Amino acid sequence: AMGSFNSSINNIHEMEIQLKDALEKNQQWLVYDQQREVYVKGLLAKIFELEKKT
Amino acid sequence: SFNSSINNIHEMEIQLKDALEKNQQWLVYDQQREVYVKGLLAKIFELEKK
Amino acid sequence: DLAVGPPSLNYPGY
């Protein structure tokens, strides 16, 4: 139908929105995880000093 | 041409299925890393009692 | 509008 055609066009609008939002989120996971790695490397260096005291 | 535009929409769908598969991988990976960080702290705790 | 992002951009944000 011509109504099913019109509806199917609107999803394709949502799809773009979904791509855009998911794209900027995997992109934010990078910054977040890069920061956690700073913390982890800190803890590891800290554990390594507590092991010299053993 | 329209057939050129429909091809892009097909590509857009491929990219979304990808951006969503990776977003899930980020989630599961995140939970594992958080469990890991707690382990490191738990080990720091045990080492400090000495 | 459903796909997940990180709790923050800084760590931890607790």
Size of interface A-C (CB pairs under 8 A): 33
Tokens standing for residue A19? 């791509």
For residues B19 and A19, is the Cβ–Cβ distance under 8 A? yes
State whether C6 and A21 contact (CB < 8 Å). no
Q: Which residues of B touch A54 (CB under 8 A)?
A: 47, 50
**Cα B48 to the chain's mean position, in Å?**
33
Task: For residue A33, give the H/E element and its range.
Answer: helix A2-50
Q: Which residues of A touch C8 (CB under 8 A)?
A: 32
Fold of A1-54: 1.20.5
Domain ranges of chain A: 1-54
Resolution, given in Å to one decimal, reads 2.9
Burial class (CB in 10 A: 0-12, 13-18, 19+), A29: buried
Question: How far from B16 is each of A29, B7, B44, CA to CA, in Å?
Answer: 17, 14, 41
Strands annotated E in B1-50: none
Please identify, in words, the CATH class of the domain defined by B1-50. mainly alpha
Tokens standing for residue C8? 């923050």
